């Protein structure tokens, strides 16, 4: 059974952003309607099918591995303390700002489950991945950032008949090619992301900055890594086009639901519901640089 | 006979756009009612008329070649996995979706095709092309880009009376432009910071500078070509914001009055999924030989 | 008598741009009720009376600073939009909208560029200016010389307008060939060479001659070869930069125009033409009211030997 | 009496805007009820007041001044049967509109030449918030620091107020001659600027707004006309308020009746076979604030 | 030429309505541009051709008698001791009702106006007119006002060919109708039931009066009258019909005020420039000194 | 000085009605500016300008009708409606239209109440009349009395009216004891509001029925019976010919916007409509007193 909706919240948390994370960058969001089922996985022939020139109906990818949505609510909260009068339901504002708590830790851990994925060099054939070992990685001036990200470019490119548009460069990395030698030089005719871009022709880079504890300790949710691939520039994700991945959402996703009064906690609690996954769905539209970021 | 019609999707279907696509940019789309007809073309005298100071009602161009638009329309599915309930018909952002699938698959047919116009040579007379050889290749450092495009320039304004207004880079010309020693040399006299294609426009003085970025999978292998080889193309393409077969300009869209149009759904319970019917009639058309200009093989290697 | 219009064509017509004509950049559209009169006329004394601040101690409340010259007379010209048949799926019914706005631009466009010659028939008649606001370039002294000096003829020129009406002139229309001259003048090049620059564009201009707007006389018409517009000339005027343009305000020129024009009509069938035919009607002369406002440098783009 | 008002044409003349005349920078208008009055005064006082932090629930700066009187100066545009096809009819928008304009600029150029009278007279400023700059002290010697004059002056203001002046007047004869300054020129040689801007004075300069003073009003018997603005150079910290209120410190404002301008509904003068517009838009400049600003008097005259 | 009309206070002019005045019943109003022209006539060959079904121009009317709109305007006033402050323009409300005091001067004259034409025996041949005398008046037990009504409906009915719609009772004369033996004993004797036996759309009572050289007159006399007046809710003066108030199009117009102080007061033109006119004459009928004493 | 104006509250004010109550039937709602005046007194010359033919276009285009007579008085009289906090949830808030209404709508009836007792005051006043507008009926030819004629009373009362101001008589006011005496008439039968205004011949017929405690109490409109033209006019205006207005403060009535008093522990509205009955036509009006009163 459906909850009763609040509406007006629920429009409030489509409109939900957080700017410095880029999990859905990589995995753009797209309805599905099903907590388990099988991932629309896009290997080399449906990605030639996709750029085929053109049997009135079509289908590109194939049932690959399962997946599982966890239904995972949690509950925002308005303690009476915030309110003039807690005999009354919020307002708009107090609600608003609860439903926020909540997504943001559904926002971070997104982003974690993101780069889980993404970085995993499990999932890549040995044509689509390579781990920097000593000095190739690029905190050493005799390392090369450009070869590296021109051989993803073409690996991609000629898989799949497109050019990568997006290039994640996790905050090591970029630190990174702001010290290499070979990546100053152009400063000095013009570092940002904006050169980087021009440099080496990819539509978006993104850079993956968030941190996550690990007693006193933060670790990188993007680790030393560097990432490029094809991700639809789709402004309506689908899980059946072809495209490196997508998080597949419960259709309506996120729900705010009309809130509660819980009398032990003495406070107003609405369900929160942001019901998804992230889903590789097409390896070949990836590539990864392991450890780019790391000491020589 | 017509179908029923869903205005929602049609509407949304009218504001689809695929960015990286060029080939409206050399073709603009413009209404037709005929499936079949002549091209309305545009030649020396037409441009000639067209740019006369002036009859109380006005004619430019002859019946030229036939046209002929294939009826092709494709049908978009929503799978019922993709519904909570599939008993109900789908809501506009599961048809929306579906919907872009066939229109996406249209937009590659419509940019081949208009390639496959533009850049044959034997479209256009002796002073509208070249075809470029050995270091006259601009991976040549021998080469000169700037000249060949001001040659471009000069044959078209000299035959109609009006500068060209399109430049089309397919991508390995762009690609050679950006390594080019004389090009790279001009980039420290302008604001730019490398050779994009904002300096070229002020270089070249053209308007619009378009990239052909598209490939389509070629052979039973794993290749894939580009869409717009390795050539460049120039030419006066109208700016009108509502394009008009009956204007001189190099070219157009041929369109059905209406399209794309997307029809109301109907069940298939063979497939399991609600489908909508997609029409997208058209055919690009070269009306205006003169307006136009094609420089072969420029991004080919030069041995 | 009156026409039945369409407004909504009547509204699209009125939207209707040509960008790279200038013509009107020189005699801005402003409404007129008469197809005959006479030109409201500004000299001297008129752009004295503009710029006079006004009198402490006077009851005058009205004020007129133009006077009846020369006459004026808007020809009817009145052209037929068409929308044929086979451009129609069912041409027994009314065209669409959008139809009937193509069939309409094409007749706009050809008023449009009659306009644009008729512009530049009236600013560069050397005829029409004293010897103070024209100059004839001979020999090296056109721009296409290296010897030449652009800068100077636009100072002299500047301060000739300026000095007759208290007004710095506000448009330069350079011809498409006394542009290109400019692109590599020597003196122009040397002037900007700190800057690291190889070419001279509008915008270095500007800074450079310090005129708010330069516009560029591209347009061509059928001489097999075409003729430009604007000629190998340069011009310099004060044109008022009034957004509702009124031909009763001091400046260089304007486009007598018909109130209300651009008017589409409602269409009618026209049976032999198998074509919907709307009336297009969009009557209007451009009129030179102030000549100390401008100024006439003549042959700037031609070829000096 | 009130007369009845044309509440379109009203809201046409409040939106009326003379982008090249400043008078508006120096005196914001701001509405009072009184045509006749004391102008609030701003001392050193009320700005240490302003700007100090906070038995009084109300918030006062100023104190009553020098008398201020507001001359009820009305106009009539008007609009002749020559300019209408039907002149028995009340004219269109259009029409009304184009023949208040004419009347505004009257008052426009009225006013500027009111606030130049007040701004620029030596006369309002006490010795430490004014120079007269003489032979190779002036802005056209080669030998002059205009740099250091501009200092000076934004030190005697963020001395007397506290603040730093945000609004800087360079009058037409004091920009050309930084134009041609050779302190200043070598600044623009270390850049890739053409000329001297305003942009760069600002920069250089660190006021937030410069305004040229460009208007001309005839001058004498002939044919002279002369600068409004004259050779000078003024600094002042002017309010910023969208909505100006004369209690606030400034170094001035335009008293303004409050509503003004207002148009009032037309009549048909028989005699004059027009259609008559009162416009009113009654008015006076005040100086409020004299150690808010600071007068440079003859920068731009020859050395 | 023109003023500056008001047009807030011109709409609620135009709304003025005055139920116990009748005029507008047997001359209602429709626009014309003319201030002087010709009376479009109906005659017997008009109302034929009105109602024989059936070249694709359509006129019934021939140019009759001259008409004459004299313009007269008059001024409204809002004198500044209603205002609490007279310095500024006075608001809609007291705008308004200064405006209706002059409409109703308007309203009054064309009341009589209309009488006056309506009423008029020179203006009807011998076949659409009687005068009661002695015992024939209705104030007698011996008249027989059913009969004359009767009388009255088949001569307009076949002249024109089509029923009389509207009956005029005079004050007087429905006073009697109220006194009758005759017309009791077919019962209150009240207009409804008057309409129902006499089988007529609609009846209208002349109650007005004004001030004669130094009492009052009934401005309908002891008079009734009886007429095919178009039903038309948009009147067109080339409709034929009984009469029209020929009004110039767009009256009533209120003008923008103006201060007057010498009268210290805020005055607004008015105009509503009209005249009656009988159209018609065989559409009409009239009954001459019914209401009046049989002796 | 000014109030602050709640408009919302005002405007539901001036729709108030007490349709019981006839005052403003003798003396209809007429605006004016100032507290004290002069009433524009109608004699018998303006009732015969109101009714003179103005033809078009004569001279004379301005249009008055009344003189300055008596003065007038209208005394400030604003009350205070008040809403208490037991009446409210939450009475630290400002109180809901329907709460506000209810407290303005007790302030109003009292004010119409006594505005009624007004209006009696000086219609039936038989020293405001000349000798041929009134009668003082005595004995049996009171009303109560089966040898009295009503009809001859009211027909000798219309032609007083009509024969001084040419025009009939609109309005007859029956007191509640008049009418009763009406009911079982025997000349009548040989009865009920519509029956008589018939039989009379007058447009409307209002009863006065209010009553005051004076454990007795006493009827507003005695054992009278008026008669009267007054204007139908649905904007009345103080400058028409007409017998009576109630000259009131234009505006009228207006709340103002509430405020709390803290030792009432209430929200209080200031409710104002400054008003005063002026008989301004007494040829228009006709008096006959003590026709309900007994025989005997
Ligand atoms: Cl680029």
Known sequence: QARVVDPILSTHARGYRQSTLIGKKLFPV???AQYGGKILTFGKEAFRLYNTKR???IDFGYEGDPYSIVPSALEAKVPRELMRDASQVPG???????????????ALAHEHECAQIALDPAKY???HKVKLVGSARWTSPDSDPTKDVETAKEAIADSIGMEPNRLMLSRKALSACKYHPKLI??????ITIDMLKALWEVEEIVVGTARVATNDSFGDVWGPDVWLGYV?????????EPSFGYTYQIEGHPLVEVPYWDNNAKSWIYGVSDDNTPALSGMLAGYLIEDAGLPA
């Open 185 to 190: 030089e152009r400063v000095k005719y013009t």
């Open 92 to 106: 708009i504002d107090l609600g608003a700002r609860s439903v926020n708590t909540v997504l943001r830790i559904m």
């Open 55 to 57: 049997t009135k109906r």
């Open 232 to 240: 639809s520039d789709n402004p309506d994700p689908s899980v059946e």
């Open 125 to 127: 054939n040995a044509d």
């Open 30 to 32: 797209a309805p599905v």
